[PDB]
Design an enzyme around this catalytic site. Structure first.
Site, PDB file in Angstrom:
ATOM      1  N   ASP A 193       0.832  -1.197   0.000  1.00 25.85           N
ATOM      2  CA  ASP A 193       0.000   0.000   0.000  1.00 25.85           C
ATOM      3  C   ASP A 193       0.878   1.264   0.000  1.00 25.85           C
ATOM      4  OD1 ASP A 193      -1.936   1.974   0.428  1.00 25.85           O
ATOM      5  OD2 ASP A 193      -2.185   1.457   2.545  1.00 25.85           O
ATOM      6  N   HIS A 349       8.056   3.354   5.957  1.00 26.04           N
ATOM      7  CA  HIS A 349       8.325   3.245   4.531  1.00 26.04           C
ATOM      8  C   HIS A 349       9.492   4.151   4.173  1.00 26.04           C
ATOM      9  CE1 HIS A 349       5.412   0.798   2.380  1.00 26.04           C
ATOM     10  NE2 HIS A 349       4.469   1.216   3.205  1.00 26.04           N
ATOM     11  N   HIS A 383       7.435  -2.557   3.609  1.00 22.40           N
ATOM     12  CA  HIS A 383       7.364  -4.007   3.778  1.00 22.40           C
ATOM     13  C   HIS A 383       8.357  -4.630   2.800  1.00 22.40           C
ATOM     14  CE1 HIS A 383       3.643  -3.549   6.065  1.00 22.40           C
ATOM     15  NE2 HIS A 383       3.201  -2.756   5.105  1.00 22.40           N
ATOM     16  N   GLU A 408       4.429  -8.984  -0.840  1.00 29.47           N
ATOM     17  CA  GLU A 408       3.036  -8.652  -0.539  1.00 29.47           C
ATOM     18  C   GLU A 408       2.135  -8.915  -1.735  1.00 29.47           C
ATOM     19  OE1 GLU A 408       1.911  -5.091   1.669  1.00 29.47           O
ATOM     20  OE2 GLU A 408      -0.168  -5.380   1.061  1.00 29.47           O
ATOM     21  N   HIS A 410      -1.386  -8.650  -1.515  1.00 22.12           N
ATOM     22  CA  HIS A 410      -2.656  -8.253  -0.926  1.00 22.12           C
ATOM     23  C   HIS A 410      -3.831  -8.401  -1.903  1.00 22.12           C
ATOM     24  CE1 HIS A 410      -4.389  -5.397   2.376  1.00 22.12           C
ATOM     25  NE2 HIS A 410      -5.199  -6.404   2.105  1.00 22.12           N
ATOM     26  N   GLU A 453       0.786  -9.254   4.385  1.00 20.19           N
ATOM     27  CA  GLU A 453      -0.505  -9.379   3.710  1.00 20.19           C
ATOM     28  C   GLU A 453      -0.428 -10.240   2.457  1.00 20.19           C
ATOM     29  OE1 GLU A 453      -1.492  -5.064   3.464  1.00 20.19           O
ATOM     30  OE2 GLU A 453      -2.911  -5.450   5.092  1.00 20.19           O
ATOM     31  N   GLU A 529       1.283  -3.876  13.424  1.00 23.50           N
ATOM     32  CA  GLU A 529       0.664  -2.581  13.106  1.00 23.50           C
ATOM     33  C   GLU A 529      -0.478  -2.274  14.067  1.00 23.50           C
ATOM     34  OE1 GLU A 529       1.289  -3.603   8.460  1.00 23.50           O
ATOM     35  OE2 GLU A 529      -0.381  -2.203   8.912  1.00 23.50           O
ATOM     36  N   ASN A 589      -7.512   5.016  -8.035  1.00 22.42           N
ATOM     37  CA  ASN A 589      -6.637   5.355  -6.923  1.00 22.42           C
ATOM     38  C   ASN A 589      -7.370   5.339  -5.583  1.00 22.42           C
ATOM     39  OD1 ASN A 589      -7.324   8.343  -6.060  1.00 22.42           O
ATOM     40  ND2 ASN A 589      -7.500   8.249  -8.285  1.00 22.42           N
ATOM     41  N   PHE A 593      -5.477   7.837   1.382  1.00 19.61           N
ATOM     42  CA  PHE A 593      -5.136   6.685   2.223  1.00 19.61           C
ATOM     43  C   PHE A 593      -3.628   6.374   2.310  1.00 19.61           C
ATOM     44  CE2 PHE A 593      -5.575   2.214   3.757  1.00 19.61           C
ATOM     45  CZ  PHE A 593      -6.254   2.514   4.932  1.00 19.61           C
ATOM     46  N   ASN A 596      -0.653   8.368   6.387  1.00 17.73           N
ATOM     47  CA  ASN A 596      -0.981   7.752   7.678  1.00 17.73           C
ATOM     48  C   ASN A 596       0.055   8.072   8.755  1.00 17.73           C
ATOM     49  OD1 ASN A 596      -1.508   4.844   5.656  1.00 17.73           O
ATOM     50  ND2 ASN A 596      -3.086   6.367   6.135  1.00 17.73           N
TER      51      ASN A 596
HETATM   52  O1  LIG Z   1      -2.876   2.270   5.818  1.00 17.96           O
HETATM   53  C1  LIG Z   1      -3.297   0.922   6.071  1.00 17.96           C
HETATM   54  C2  LIG Z   1      -2.080   0.066   6.426  1.00 17.96           C
HETATM   55  O2  LIG Z   1      -2.561  -1.100   7.119  1.00 17.96           O
HETATM   56  C3  LIG Z   1      -2.340  -2.466   6.695  1.00 17.96           C
HETATM   57  O3  LIG Z   1      -3.557  -3.080   6.216  1.00 17.96           O
HETATM   58  C4  LIG Z   1      -4.328  -2.335   5.251  1.00 17.96           C
HETATM   59  C5  LIG Z   1      -5.848  -2.474   5.367  1.00 17.96           C
HETATM   60  O4  LIG Z   1      -6.391  -2.329   4.051  1.00 17.96           O
HETATM   61  C6  LIG Z   1      -7.822  -2.400   3.982  1.00 17.96           C
HETATM   62  O5  LIG Z   1      -8.252  -2.238   2.623  1.00 17.96           O
HETATM   63  C7  LIG Z   1      -8.352  -3.745   4.463  1.00 17.96           C
HETATM   64  O6  LIG Z   1      -9.783  -3.681   4.562  1.00 17.96           O
HETATM   65  C8  LIG Z   1      -7.761  -4.153   5.811  1.00 17.96           C
HETATM   66  O7  LIG Z   1      -7.950  -5.571   5.939  1.00 17.96           O
HETATM   67  C9  LIG Z   1      -6.269  -3.815   5.985  1.00 17.96           C
HETATM   68  O8  LIG Z   1      -5.941  -3.792   7.385  1.00 17.96           O
HETATM   69  C10 LIG Z   1      -1.135  -2.685   5.761  1.00 17.96           C
HETATM   70  O9  LIG Z   1      -0.333  -3.738   6.298  1.00 17.96           O
HETATM   71  C11 LIG Z   1      -0.287  -1.427   5.594  1.00 17.96           C
HETATM   72  O10 LIG Z   1       0.716  -1.575   4.581  1.00 17.96           O
HETATM   73  C12 LIG Z   1      -1.184  -0.255   5.231  1.00 17.96           C
HETATM   74  O11 LIG Z   1      -1.970  -0.572   4.078  1.00 17.96           O
HETATM   75 MG   LIG Z   2      -1.524  -3.969   1.703  1.00 16.49          MG
HETATM   76 NA    NA Z   3      -2.235   3.490   3.840  1.00 17.17          NA
END
Ligand SMILES: OC[C@H]1O[C@@H](OC[C@H]2O[C@@H](O)[C@H](O)[C@@H](O)[C@@H]2O)[C@H](O)[C@@H](O)[C@H]1O
Ligand SMILES: [Mg+2]
Ligand code: NA
Ligand SMILES: [Mg+2]
Ligand SMILES: [Mg+2]
Ligand SMILES: [Mg+2]
Ligand code: NA
Ligand code: NA
Ligand code: NA
Ligand code: NA
Lengths: 1015, 210
Positions: A193, A349, A383, A408, A410, A453, A529, A589, A593, A596
């Site tokens: 992410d 990151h 990650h 990852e 995801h 993930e 986290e 996009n 998000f 953070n």
């Molecule tokens: O900023 C979020 C952060 O948390 C972690 O998990 C992301 C989050 O994404 C959502 O779309 C899902 O519903 C949920 O299951 C999930 O917790 C992630 O390890 C981080 O890299 C980052 O995305």
């Molecule tokens: Mg992710």
């Molecule tokens: Na994020």
């Protein structure tokens, strides 16, 4: 062949002709240079100006580019991400892959970066030995040519790729051609992410080694029970021709003192029926009373590995920093040097707002300093493996590191689709094994992680066991598949709550307290986290820390996350603004998000950072009578750079202050007896504030650094003495439309159609631009909005329930508006119903009492319908005419604080410029609140009571309607929000309701009272 | 000195309004120079006969949190029944009210007293919006107990059989009442969320005739 084979669409080929991975090399030919870590002439940097051309696909790349420069090419700085130079757009997506999910295939329109470099190689480098090129980071795959001839291929964006150039180079001018693909089969394992970028984004270098060379070395440190004795074991491997006269010497250094040394010929012990490793040797060195490495005291030794001849001629030397430390899990606790860790961690990151994903020493040092200054002791490499310098700095400054494989997936459905597939085991294995081979000698690395993930697949179990087998010195963790699978030594959930269960099918997130004691469970729990710090967040942070301290097996966690992933864009005048997902034409996009962080992209702190610092304090305090008890949460160090400053104040007025030196053993206690405190003359609340000051500078902090603080209420003396009766009496003028109250050069006007104080006059000057009205809504926070993927909406999200109930549309309807004359006051009484589509949400009943002293006493009693969603706030707002320079208040501060994030704030008299009362979150929302305020001063105005407030040039309406901070315009006058009550901000996560029940406005009936006067 | 502290008058005024009379009071309870509590009230008697009592209390942060914040008086009337809209039918306290249900309850006066063998505060009902006793009606959001035994008599008597019905009925109407605890009975056992620690307190009552 290169076009025909399409190696970037084959998970079976992750490299061609790539050399073995290994710990950092410099190939010193001088042992003293190796000892002191001086630069090496045998390690040359190729960073600087390269030539670059962008193409839409690898098929579009002209064959001539292999042989000579494209005149169409530009000259660019390397390392770089090519999106940062404007060649194409960076893409921000969270879960959904930025390419069609069709493994192992990638789009035919595959952005291709063609890098080239003309450089000199001296003959001496080619006459003997081996010349290799090192690419520390290339995103996401690449082919390499040298002087027109194909050399090799590499994948994995986050680890070095090395190729022998010995047979490709010529004396004098040479040319490299590097064809970098944005997408490859490796991209399926790179779904973190973050911004999706590409290019040669880490260092490029050339390394000369002799033909007879150190090819690998591993350093282990083992200890006796009380760590008074250590054995350093160094396994060394060679390449080249074996000769009886060859030797290896390993020496250990403490500063300029050699403490131990060992020499041996090559030839390992017998390991099986075929013998042993003839090309390896293991030296063992005894160390008495070693100085131990920790984040508290990062004691380091230097190990020098020399390859030489029996008669003393050096061939080459390598070296590393050695930290004597043991990491083990015993009886359900993660121990470091025999003591249980409390992990004050953060995810970080590698992000820069100008340079994208290119990391530099200055940014790294800045991050480490701010982390340590804010009581962090640990970092998770979210990650992927980091830039190699990161580990060196963590070794030297003292931070515990979770080193994480670049895996990852995801976006797969289900998440383990690839990781349970044996076809993807080879590709996954290289991302794990090559990380270990590179980083295993770093003392800062204490935990290995299998990635992020990617569900839980059989491939994870296999690679878990691989690490356990080659490196027993470090626990292995992995969160995927429910955080407690057979592929993890540590229960490591993300966003598991303190007390609340979230029982999702197959992958539940239990209350962390409950998780520990599930039948059969014995492992320690450390959140990989937690406390998602998106915008105005970190509500409930203290609840985590209270739990971490009470439960032995709750050993902390890593906050998500360190720094906002915002990028710089420029307006038409060249002014920079912070951009996020969607701002580069990137689509689809996930908008804001990517932001953070505890800090802005430029490392300016969010208000949340101070809350983290306070909760993560290393000293704990209790007050009993005259006694302060100071408890140390350090495991190793005495408090040898600390003093306690105490201060007793009466409603902000200093009464007594002193200082005592702290002399506390690790885990120990010290009792400080306060002197007899003089009784205050005036009425009011006495407050004790203590703070821990570091008198001396360190590597990581300036002299006078505050590391801890705490406040207590002391004696309070309630005001019984009535104010002396003012002689003047206010006059009520009634008309059909208004109730007017006059007292000298003071008027108060109450509109009788609306029921609000619509205007106030001091002489002929208007005080209000907008009437004083009730407000029950806030410009929604990121947590309120609760969106992690732009597509998905959670109907349970606070903003959704508020919208559906009509909170932002609610119309005030007047029920009652009357005026009365008292002996020495005018009393206005109002009642309003707030209604949406026939349904009454709120009723507000008020009295305004204006006396001879010109003070207006406002009493507010609010009913909230039990079936309407709990409102964000219960308060009043108005737009004042005045724009003043300072805001002065007695209450919690100085920084922004909310009901569930105010523990760091201290009660005192604070005075700030108006601009500091606004927090510039990139995505604008409710911000700048200060809680527990008894007195507020702005220009000619004073408000007294027990309230929360924010004050700024932006209305809630503008903040609600504006997507970026740079688009906000100062409004006429000053918008004041004064709340008797304000809802928590939440943050446990930012994609579902996260405001704990005790911080929701659920009481049904609320009362608050304010006095408005002229200062 | 909570059991010893006497009310000292600070303010007592009267004002004639358009359709009401307003009495405004202020008191301080003190023990050896220390102000424990401050009570500020308005009584608003209107043309319909209803008396609205608004009470705002301050409790010194450094005094032990008080057992209750409310009013009491001894009514002349002895009635047969007590009728309330609130939690019941049985005795319930803030940290022991989950069993009780919100509804309209009607019991004989004697059921509003719990005959604990060692007498104490007893018979409270919480979450009450309306209380009826003879011709009297109280409305608001309060906790109450009602009986022929004063808090003082209960405090001074060690056995239930030695209690004697006093003249009329003692009414205690509380805006707030401390939890009873009981995790054990030999140390402080009332949980923090049930202690009266807020510092400032507000409640309103409307007293009228049925
Ligand atoms: O900023 C979020 C952060 O948390 C972690 O998990 C992301 C989050 O994404 C959502 O779309 C899902 O519903 C949920 O299951 C999930 O917790 C992630 O390890 C981080 O890299 C980052 O995305
Ligand atoms: Mg992710
Ligand atoms: Na994020
Ligand atoms: Mg491939
Ligand atoms: Mg340097
Ligand atoms: Mg119930
Ligand atoms: Na713990
Ligand atoms: Na000290
Ligand atoms: Na907004
Ligand atoms: Na008794």
């Amino acid at each position: 062949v290169v076009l025909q084979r399409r190696d970037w669409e084959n998970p079976g080929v992750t490299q061609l002709n790539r050399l073995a991975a290994h710990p950092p090399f410099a190939s010193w030919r001088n042992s003293e240079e190796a000892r002191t870590d001086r630069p090496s002439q045998q390690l040359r940097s190729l960073n600087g100006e390269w030539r670059f051309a962008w193409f839409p696909a690898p098929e579009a790349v002209p064959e001539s580019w292999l042989e000579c420069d494209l005149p169409e090419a530009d000259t660019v700085v390397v390392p770089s991400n090519w999106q940062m130079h404007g060649y194409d757009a960076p893409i921000y997506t969270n879960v959904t892959y930025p390419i069609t999910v069709n493994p192992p295939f990638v789009p035919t329109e595959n952005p291709t970066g063609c890098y080239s470099l003309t450089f000199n190689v001296d003959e001496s480098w080619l006459q003997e030995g081996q010349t290799r090129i090192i690419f520390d980071g290339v995103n996401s795959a690449f082919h390499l040519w040298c002087n027109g001839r194909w050399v090799g291929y590499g994948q994995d964006s986050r680890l070095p790729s090395e190729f022998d150039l010995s047979a490709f180079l010529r004396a004098g001018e040479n040319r490299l051609a590097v064809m970098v693909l944005r997408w490859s089969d490796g991209s399926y394992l790179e779904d973190q992410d973050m911004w999706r970028m590409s290019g040669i984004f880490r260092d490029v270098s050339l390394l000369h080694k002799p033909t007879t060379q150190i090819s690998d070395f591993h350093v282990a440190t083992r200890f006796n029970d009380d760590f008074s004795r250590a054995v350093l074991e160094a396994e060394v491997q060679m390449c080249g021709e074996l000769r009886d006269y060859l030797r290896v010497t390993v020496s250990l250094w403490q500063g300029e003192t050699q403490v131990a040394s060992g020499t041996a010929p090559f030839g390992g012990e017998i390991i099986d029926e075929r013998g042993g490793y003839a090309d390896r040797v293991t030296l063992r060195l005894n160390v008495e009373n070693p100085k131990l490495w920790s984040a508290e005291i990062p004691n380091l030794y230097r190990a020098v590995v020399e390859l030489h001849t029996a008669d003393g001629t050096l061939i080459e030397a390598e070296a590393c920093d050695v930290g004597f430390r043991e990491v083990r899990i015993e009886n359900g606790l993660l121990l470091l040097n025999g003591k249980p860790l409390l992990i004050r961690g953060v995810n970080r990151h590698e992000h820069h707002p100008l340079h994208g994903q290119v990391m530099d020493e200055q940014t790294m040092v800045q991050d480490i300093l701010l982390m340590k200054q804010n009581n962090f002791n640990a970092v998770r490499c979210s990650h992927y493996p980091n830039h190699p310098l990161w580990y060196t700095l963590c070794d030297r400054y003292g931070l515990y590191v979770v080193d994480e494989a670049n895996i990852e997936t995801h976006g797969m459905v289900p998440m383990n689709r690839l990781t349970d597939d044996p076809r993807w085991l080879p590709a996954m294995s290289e991302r794990v094994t090559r990380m270990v081979q590179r980083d295993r000698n770093h003392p800062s690395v204490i935990i290995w992680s299998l990635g992020n993930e990617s569900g839980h697949g059989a491939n994870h179990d296999a690679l878990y066991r691989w690490i356990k087998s080659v490196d027993p010195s470090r626990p292995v963790q992995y969160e995927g598949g429910g955080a407690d699978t057979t592929a993890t030594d540590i229960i490591c959930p993300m966003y598991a709550r303190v007390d609340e269960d979230q029982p999702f099918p197959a992958v539940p997130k239990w209350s962390i307290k409950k998780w520990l004691s599930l039948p059969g469970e014995t492992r320690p729990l450390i959140l990989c986290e937690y406390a998602h710090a998106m915008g105005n967040s970190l509500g409930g942070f203290a609840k985590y820390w209270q739990a971490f301290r009470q439960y032995p097996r709750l050993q902390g966690g890593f906050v998500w996350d360190w720094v906002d992933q915002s990028l710089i864009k420029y307006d038409e005048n060249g002014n920079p603004w912070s951009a996020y997902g969607g701002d580069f034409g990137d689509t689809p996009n996930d908008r804001q998000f990517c932001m953070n962080g505890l800090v802005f992209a430029d490392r300016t702190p969010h208000p949340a950072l101070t809350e983290a610092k306070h909760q993560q304090q290393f000293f704990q305090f209790r007050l009993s009578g005259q006694t302060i008890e100071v408890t140390s949460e350090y495991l190793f160090r005495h408090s040898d750079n600390e003093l306690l400053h105490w201060m007793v104040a009466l409603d902000g007025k200093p009464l007594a202050s002193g200082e005592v030196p702290l002399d506390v053993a690790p885990q120990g206690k010290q009792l400080i007896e306060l002197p007899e405190l003089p009784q205050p003359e005036s009425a009011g609340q006495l407050w004790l504030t203590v703070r821990v000051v570091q008198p001396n500078a360190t590597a990581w902090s300036e002299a006078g650094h505050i590391s801890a603080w705490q406040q207590w209420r002391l004696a309070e003396n309630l005001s019984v003495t009535l104010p002396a009766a003012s002689h003047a009496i206010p006059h009520l003028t009634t008309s059909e439309m208004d109730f007017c109250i006059e007292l000298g050069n003071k008027r108060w006007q109450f509109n009788r159609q609306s029921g609000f104080l619509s205007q106030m006059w001091i002489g002929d000057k208007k005080q209000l631009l907008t009437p004083l009205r009730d407000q029950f809504t806030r410009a929604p926070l990121d947590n309120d909005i609760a969106v992690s993927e732009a597509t998905r909406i959670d109907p349970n999200a606070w903003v959704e329930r508020w919208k559906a109930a009509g909170h932002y549309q609610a119309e005030a309807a007047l029920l009652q508006c009357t005026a009365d004359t008292l002996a020495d006051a005018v009393l206005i009484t109002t009642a309003h119903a707030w209604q949406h589509q026939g349904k009454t949400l709120f009723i507000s009943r008020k009295t305004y009492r204006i006396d001879g002293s010109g003070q207006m006493a406002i009493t507010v009693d609010v009913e909230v319908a039990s079936d309407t969603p709990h409102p964000a706030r219960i308060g009043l707002n108005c737009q004042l005419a005045q724009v003043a320079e300072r805001v002065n208040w007695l209450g919690l501060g100085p920084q922004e604080n909310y009901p569930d994030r105010l523990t760091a704030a201290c009660f005192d008299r604070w005075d700030l410029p108006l601009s500091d009362m606004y927090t510039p979150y990139v995505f604008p929302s409710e911000n700048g609140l200060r809680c527990g305020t008894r007195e507020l001063n702005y220009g000619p105005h004073q408000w007294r009571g027990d309230f929360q407030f924010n004050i700024s040039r932006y209305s809630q309406q503008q903040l609600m309607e504006t997507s970026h901070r740079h688009l906000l315009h100062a409004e006429e006058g000053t918008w004041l929000n004064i709340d008797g009550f304000h809802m928590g901000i939440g943050g446990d996560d930012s994609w579902s309701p996260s405001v704990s029940a005790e911080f929701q406005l659920s009481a049904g009936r609320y009362h608050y009272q304010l006095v408005w006067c002229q200062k």
